[PDB]
Amino acid sequence: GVQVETISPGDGRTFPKRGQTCVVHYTGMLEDGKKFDSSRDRNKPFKFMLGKQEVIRGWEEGVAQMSVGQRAKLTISPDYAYGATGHPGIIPPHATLVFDVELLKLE
């Protein structure tokens, strides 16, 4: 599954809905702390639409639990991420992923 652990609270009332665009900042890490990517290093938020099937399943499920303004750590099991394939060259097979995600805005 995905485990959502809060870093900073959101407004507690504006949660993303299917068809909305979530504007997030993120840093993705492996369980040992190794960063594999971060939009914070590019200083440009990442956008995805909820329910469109264009991000990994632990994101659709985890970010839907977040209210605008919230910063949380999402621990995502491999079956909710890249499974046995992994992402060629970046994520190994069977990897648990840890994302530090801040939900900035809904568009």
Residues of this chain that interact with ligand SB3 (CB under 6 A) are 26, 28, 36-37, 46, 55-56, 59, 82, 87, 90-91
Minimum gap (Å) between residue 46 Cβ and ligand SB3: 5
From the list 10, 14, 29, the residue with the least C-alpha distance to 74 is 29
From the list 87, 81, 63, the residue with the least C-alpha distance to 73 is 63
In the complex with ligand SB3, which residue's Cβ is closer, 15 or 99?
A: 99
Do the Cβ atoms of 68 and 102 come closer than 8 Å?
A: no
- Is 37 one of the annotated active-site residues of the chain? yes
For the annotated catalytic residues, the residue numbers are: 26, 36-37, 56, 82, 99
